[PDB]
Amino acid sequence: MDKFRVQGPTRLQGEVTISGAKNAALPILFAALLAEEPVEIQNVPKLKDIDTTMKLLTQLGTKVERXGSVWIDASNVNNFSAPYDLVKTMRASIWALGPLVARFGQGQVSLPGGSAIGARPVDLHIFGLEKLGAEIKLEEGYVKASVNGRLKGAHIVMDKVSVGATVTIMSAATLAEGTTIIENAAREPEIVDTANFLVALGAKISGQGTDRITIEGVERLGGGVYRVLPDRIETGTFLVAAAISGGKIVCRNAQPDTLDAVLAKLREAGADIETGEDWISLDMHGKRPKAVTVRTAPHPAFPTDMQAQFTLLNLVAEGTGVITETIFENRFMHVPELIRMGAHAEIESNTVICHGVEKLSGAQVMATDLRASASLVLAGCIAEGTTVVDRIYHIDRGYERIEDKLRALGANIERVKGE
Numbered sequence: 262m263d264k265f266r267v268q269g270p271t272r273l274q275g276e277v278t279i280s281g282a283k284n285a286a287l288p289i290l291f292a293a294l295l296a297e298e299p300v301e302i303q304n305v306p307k308l309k310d311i312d313t314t315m316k317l318l319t320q321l322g323t324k325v326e327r328x329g330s331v332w333i334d335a336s337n338v339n340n341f342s343a344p345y346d347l348v349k350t351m352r353a354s355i356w357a358l359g360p361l362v363a364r365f366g367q368g369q370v371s372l373p374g375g376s377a378i379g380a381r382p383v384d385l386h387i388f389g390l391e392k393l394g395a396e397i398k399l400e401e402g403y404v405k406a407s408v409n410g411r412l413k414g415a416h417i418v419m420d421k422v423s424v425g426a427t428v429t430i431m432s433a434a435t436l437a438e439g440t441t442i443i444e445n446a447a448r449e450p451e452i453v454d455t456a457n458f459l460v461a462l463g464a465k466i467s468g469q470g471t472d473r474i475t476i477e478g479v480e481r482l483g484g485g486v487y488r489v490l491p492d493r494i495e496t497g498t499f500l501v502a503a504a505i506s507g508g509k510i511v512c513r514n515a516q517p518d519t520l521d522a523v524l525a526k527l528r529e530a531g532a533d534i535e536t537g538e539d540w541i542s543l544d545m546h547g548k549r550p551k552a553v554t555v556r557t558a559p560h561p562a563f564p565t566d567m568q569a570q571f572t573l574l575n576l577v578a579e580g581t582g583v584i585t586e587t588i589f590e591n592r593f594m595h596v597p598e599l600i601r602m603g604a605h606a607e608i609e610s611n612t613v614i615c616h617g618v619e620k621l622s623g624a625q626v627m628a629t630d631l632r633a634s635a636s637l638v639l640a641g642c643i644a645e646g647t648t649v650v651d652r653i654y655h656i657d658r659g660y661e662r663i664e665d666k667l668r669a670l671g672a673n674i675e676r677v678k679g680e
């Protein structure tokens with residue numbers, strides 16, 4: 262069980278290169294199952310789910326190899342069943358289903374079970390494919406889908422916003438006969454990226470980024486080269502790292518327009534920010550941040566995946582700021598840990614009232630949520646003394662070696678294997 266021993270305080274300054282977003286690479290890699298010709302997917306991070314996905318695609322008959330790019334040749338996919346042993350560690354595996362049924366007429370994916378029923382993640386994927394004409398068969402543990410002929414474009418109205426089902430429906434719709442219209446579509450930049458990838462292969466999609474996506478089916482998709490967009494959450498994490506340590510940083514290989522709400526909030530906290538075509542710089546001019554008011558909401562509003570980081574920012578800022586979480590009902594586990602680090606905060610239902618203090622003190626802390634864990638590592642960078650963040654594998658699965666990026670910004674951090 263690896264942990265990070267972090268010693269502070271350190272002002273974080275310098276440059277950091279933003280990695281491709283795993284949440285865009287994953288749906289794009291599964292979308293590549295639709296490609297009849299070789300595809301090169303650029304800027305793919307080296308993370309566990311990517312390895313899991315490459316192994317799964319290989320099991321389906323895809324030829325795959327990687328470095329910064331992942332090269333895919335799906336011309337001869339010939340096994341349309343994704344087995345339990347290859348999907349069990351990854352929910353994103355459901356994304357193999359739509360492309361398999363859309364292109365080959367059959368697909369099956371094993372699904373981890375549960376005693377809980379109703380609103381299980383895969384339900385909207387299933388019902389969306391059913392609306393496109395697929396015949397769905399369910400037995401605990403798996404979903405099999407097939408279609409007699411080609412899928413048929415349909416007007417689908419999503420009752421709740423779902424990034425996963427939007428990707429499944431949009432991707433499968435690219436090879437359906439006719440027009441598919443998705444109402445209340447998820448607007449996330451990763452949806453836009455997946456849509457642009459499909460268009461690069463020959464698909465006809467418009468409206469990506471808005472609540473209504475229109476797909477005009479085509480007979481087949483080809484191949485090409487496509488670069489995965491930058492990880493907007495990783496970017497926000499490094500911007501916050503500088504913002505809370507009186508730092509100065511330049512985030513390279515970034516995409517500013519996927520972060521409008523985050524950059525606006527950082528400017529409210531007192532940051533001097535400039536943006537370029539593929540970069541964002543932030544300078545606190547050595548000052549402590551000013552507390553801000555945050556309300557998470559669906560993209561393009563402020564992202565829940567930046568909530569823990571901004572709570573930390575408020576907890577060392579000047580003033581009182583309230584963070585309201587409207588997306589998840591229990592995403593505040595970082596708070597007790599920070600309070601153990603000397604922070605002053607009160608939880609009131611779906612909000613945390615923060616009363617900024619000048620300095621935190623090191624402690625042994627841990628959070629299972631990826632963003633909460635990474636925020637503890639950032640708190641460790643500015644706290645006096647030693648902070649030990651346990652169960653760092655959560656971070657490793659969503660950030661490409663965060664400690665090396667932080668160390669290059671001046672952090673004193675080390676991976677301790679065990680203790």
Ligand SMILES: [NH3+]C1CCCCC1
Binds near residue numbers: 340367368369406
């Ligand atoms: N009997 C089959 C069901 C669909 C996927 C391939 C195996």
